[PDB]
Amino acid sequence: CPPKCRCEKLLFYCDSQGFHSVPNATDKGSLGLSLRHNHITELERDQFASFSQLTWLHLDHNQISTVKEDAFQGLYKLKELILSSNKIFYLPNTTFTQLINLQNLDLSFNQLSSLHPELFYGLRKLQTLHLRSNSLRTIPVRLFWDCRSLEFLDLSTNRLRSLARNGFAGLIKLRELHLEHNQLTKINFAHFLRLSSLHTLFLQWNKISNLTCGMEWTWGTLEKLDLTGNEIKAIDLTVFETMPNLKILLMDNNKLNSLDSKILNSLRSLTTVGLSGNLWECSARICALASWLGSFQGRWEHSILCHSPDHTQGEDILDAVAGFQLCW
């Protein structure tokens, strides 16, 4: 066993030592390797050539800034690669293609600004992909073409300006998608047409003004939609016709003014809703919403309060409806 490193088995645990590069190994039949919280700044070509039998490799919290081409070559049996919390900003297009049995890839908390359209080609056994907390501004249309068995994708905390029409091609088995804390402006749900297995979609804390749906379709698998903390003021009357099995809808802290009865009549499978913090106008317009609440049989965690006119501010909708003779 190499110096400064304790080895429980074929697993090598080399966390929290002052390693500026990967140590050469007396035993090359190691199954796992941990190099966490060292100060590695560079990954050489064929650096892990000795560790052929590696199944998981942890390189998190290192100052890695440059990754040479063919850095991970020969790691055919590798199924987990953690590269989070580094200073990586460029990745050669051939850097992951050899790693066929990869299942979990973490590239979060890095300085990536863009990704090569063929970076994730040939990762068919990939299940989870963490790209959280990067400075990506755009995303290649073909990036996920080969990601057949991916079911978790994290793109939160980036600088995504907007969504490509068919960027998601090949994510047919994706279940959970994280797009929160980006900089989206509008949402055209026709853009998610290719994600036919999605059950949860997180879009909170963007800058979303509009909710539209260009192509009519049925997203039968979507069950949870989190839109908390955007700037939503307008919603096309058919965007929830698309999600018949939607059971959790969160739209707190937006700029919603009211809701058409056409909208609310589609949201009947809901078990949980969130409508707090919106700019509700308490007048005859909210009757659609007020009546729905009486009819509703699901739950809502926080009370829904009027914002306009001023004399109704902060008062629960139903209390204000019955108190001011607004309906019926």
């Binding site: 004399h311 501010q313 902060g314 008062e315 629960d316 139903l318 209390d319 108190g323």
Partner: protein, 178 residues
């Protein structure tokens, strides 16, 4: 037995007022008002909290026929609660406590049975954007004459704040800080 910060409201009428900053005028779902007083008057208005310009919301504490009471409005309608079992204008010190939870109200004279009053149905719960506290009831045409101590309104010791020459406070009329 009356000790605490106290103001003498003598003949001619008097008034202590507090002005909230324009932006921070609070809204409250519940209110807690406690005042220490002594008087011999048959009719007067002790404290009144009025909403900002353009709002009908208000809270008024007053004496009518020697009986202490409270009248308030969340927006829509007036709600009244009064201690009618007995009299408080005997000249001795009393502490009356008022409590509001939305439509509900509570009155309790010092060391007497508590009065609880619950409105029917569902009421408006919010007292909306409080602008001023007017202690004295001069502007209502029923100025108070006597001594007021330990006034408490939603965490504010207003009289104590007047005795500390708070910048917002405006002291007018025949009022003395004994």
């Amino acid at each position: 037995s009356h000790a605490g910060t106290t103001y003498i409201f003598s003949k001619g009428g008097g008034q202590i007022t507090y002005k909230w900053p324009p932006n921070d005028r609070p809204s409250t779902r519940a209110d807690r008002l406690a005042i220490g007083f002594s008087t011999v008057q048959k009719e007067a208005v002790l404290v009144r909290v009025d909403s900002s310009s353009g709002l009908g919301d208000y809270l008024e504490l007053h004496i009518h026929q020697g009986k202490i009471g409270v009248k308030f409005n969340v927006g829509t309608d007036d709600i009244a609660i009064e201690e009618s079992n007995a009299i408080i204008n005997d000249g001795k010190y009393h502490v009356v406590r008022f409590t509001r939870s939305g439509g509900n109200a509570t009155l309790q004279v010092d060391s007497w049975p508590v009065i609880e009053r619950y409105p029917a149905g569902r009421q408006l719960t919010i007292f909306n954007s409080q602008a001023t506290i007017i202690i004295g009831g001069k502007e209502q045409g029923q100025p108070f004459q006597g001594q007021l101590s330990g006034l408490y309104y939603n965490g504010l010791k207003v009289l104590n704040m007047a005795a500390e020459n708070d910048a917002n406070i405006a002291i007018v009329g025949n009022v003395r800080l004994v």
